[PDB]
Amino acid sequence: AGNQRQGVAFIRVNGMELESMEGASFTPSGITREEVTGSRVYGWKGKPRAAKVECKIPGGGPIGLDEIIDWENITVEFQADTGETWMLANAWQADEPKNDGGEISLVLMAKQSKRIA
């Protein structure tokens, strides 16, 4: 809004909004720039990057864990409470999913994310 800052974020997979915990991460897909020095400082150098979305889901919810561990081609939407939205298409569930005391960690990853709306 006029002075509103981002306090919470919403993550939606295939239209189902996920019961996400506090502290949800988001890494846009782009170019990672490194540093080059020889006898002096010369410039930077690029490296491709992949979009990542991280969150935590309580256990026993509407969405089962077997469904979570079987996501290969899904649509992930990351929306901030202020109104900023990013869309991830053909995403997949990466890393090892674990149910640690009712906490399930999602590492939903995609090869390209664009800022819609």
Binding site: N14, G15, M87, A89, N90, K114, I116
Partner: protein
């Protein structure tokens, strides 16, 4: 039941291996829902298939048995199967039409003064008879009649006849087709390949029939097609009464109601002026016709081969142009009967597709376009011109339908801005917006659309204020371009 087995009982219990040999080369009956095609054709006498009933054909021998040997439909099915063995083939026979079965006569006269051979090309089939020194025309006519009777695939029957007070050498052969229609007439040539000539002293001539025949009605056949989606249709009958019904049915299927897209491929044989007049007359965006003059083979064979090649190529990719694909087994016309560059360009401007002849003897597709030329108010319109446009539009519609029916089987509609929260299975116009954007990304990655920012800015999703259960969306895609013309200028320095 996919493979039809002969002399092998279906109830066998001895554990062993059963091996059978069969000369006919059948085609696997694997279902191809996205490559269903339909063919229209006539069936001669001794046919075992009921008229106006579609039947699945998977081998040339089966088609010949069902529709009779030498029939139009059997030859068309064989030509289709000799070039496309992956698409589902459906053939529906027709009636008999009006007219006469006579197609002309071949007149032979004179005596041969040297050893040689006489080669006659009837309906594109080579027929060679040995010629001895001193042989008369009557003996050559008898040998030709025997050779024609030997060949069972000729859609003509030959009888010998000699009369009048002329010399005994003269004797003409009367030809009669196996079916009645506008395509019953055939072409007769005596020298097609190089190094072939008529023996000296032998005079050969061909006199065509004077009457005109009419194509059979297709109303019953078009009514009995069914409700399946035939993506490609082969129509050999190039006459106004039949094409009007075909256009009506296709445009009824093309609408948003039926959603069963269909395309028709035809080939017209005649002079340049007739082809131009026909192309100018027809103004449909669902039929593509290719013009050819002086074709040794009948038109429907070319139509079947072209439809098979185009169907396979467009099923592999709906956006790749049809620029250099070749037609296997189709004889090109003579050197003096091929259209020049100006004629081909005018035909392309007149809604008639054009072909080309390879460096060898192969005939290749040049560019495939539809009959659509004129806007509704009468102006020129480049839309709906290339067949690639129609194929891409059909594929996009099918993909959108599949995505919507899969991702959202059965949901509940709510207005934008409402607070529904987690858990509920409701859908917001923003959700459909995002899903359409993702599908557009998939389309662009697949190589069908080019511009994304314009598509996103032109999107608009909203609910209907009257139905309350219908969501209205208006989108515009930017279909990608094709590489057709390569213009170059060379500035030599010498």
């Amino acid at each position: 039941s996919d493979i039809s087995f002969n002399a092998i009982p279906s109830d066998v219990r001895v554990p062993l291996t059963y091996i059978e040999f069969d000369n006919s080369n059948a085609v696997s009956g694997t279902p191809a829902p996205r490559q269903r095609v339909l063919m229209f054709g006539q069936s001669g006498s001794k046919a075992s298939a009921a008229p106006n009933v579609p039947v699945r054909i998977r081998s040339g021998s089966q088609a010949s048995a069902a529709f009779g040997q030498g029939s139009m439909l059997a030859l068309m099915a064989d030509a289709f199967l000799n070039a496309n063995r992956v698409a589902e083939l459906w053939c529906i026979p027709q009636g008999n039409g009006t007219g006469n079965a006579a197609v002309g006569e071949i007149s032979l006269s004179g005596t041969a003064g040297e050893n040689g051979s006489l080669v006659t090309y009837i309906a594109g089939q080579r027929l060679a008879v040995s010629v001895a020194a001193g042989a008369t025309g009557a003996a050559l006519a008898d040998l030709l009649v025997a050779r024609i009777k030997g060949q069972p695939d000729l859609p003509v029957t030959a009888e010998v006849r000699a009369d009048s007070g002329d010399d005994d050498t003269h004797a003409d052969v009367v030809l009669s087709a196996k079916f009645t229609g506008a395509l019953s007439a055939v072409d007769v040539r005596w020298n097609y390949y190089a190094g072939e000539t008529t023996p000296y002293g032998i005079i050969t001539a061909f006199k065509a029939a004077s009457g005109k025949n009419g194509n059979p009605d297709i109303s019953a056949s078009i009514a009995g097609m069914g409700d399946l989606q035939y993506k490609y249709i082969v129509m050999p009958y190039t006459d106004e009464p039949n094409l009007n019904l075909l256009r009506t049915e296709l445009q009824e299927r093309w609408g948003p109601v039926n959603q069963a897209d269909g395309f028709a491929v035809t080939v017209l044989s005649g002079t340049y002026g007739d082809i131009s007049t026909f192309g100018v007359s027809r103004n449909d965006h669902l039929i593509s016709c290719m013009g050819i003059a002086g074709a040794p083979e009948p038109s429907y064979l070319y139509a079947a081969t072209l439809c098979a090649v185009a169907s396979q190529a467009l099923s592999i990719d709906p956006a790749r142009p049809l620029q250099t694909l070749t037609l296997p087994g189709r004889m090109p016309p003579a050197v003096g009967d091929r259209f020049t560059w100006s004629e081909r360009n005018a035909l392309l401007f007149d809604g008639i597709s054009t072909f080309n002849v390879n460096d060898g003897g192969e005939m290749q597709i040049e560019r495939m376009i539809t009959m659509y030329r004129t806007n509704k108010y009468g102006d020129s319109d480049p839309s709906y011109l290339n067949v690639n446009t129609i194929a891409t539009l059909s594929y996009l519609r099918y993909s959108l339908r599949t995505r919507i029916t899969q991702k959202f089987p059965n949901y509940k509609l709510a207005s934008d801005g409402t607070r529904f929260a987690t858990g509920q299975a409701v859908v917001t116009p923003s959700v459909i917006k995002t899903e359409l954007l993702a599908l557009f990304e998939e389309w662009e990655n697949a190589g069908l659309v080019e511009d994304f920012d314009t598509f996103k800015e032109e999107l608009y999703v909203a609910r209907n204020k009257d139905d309350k259960d219908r969501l209205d969306v208006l989108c515009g895609p930017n279909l990608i371009n094709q590489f057709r013309i390569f213009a170059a200028q060379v500035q030599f320095i010498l």
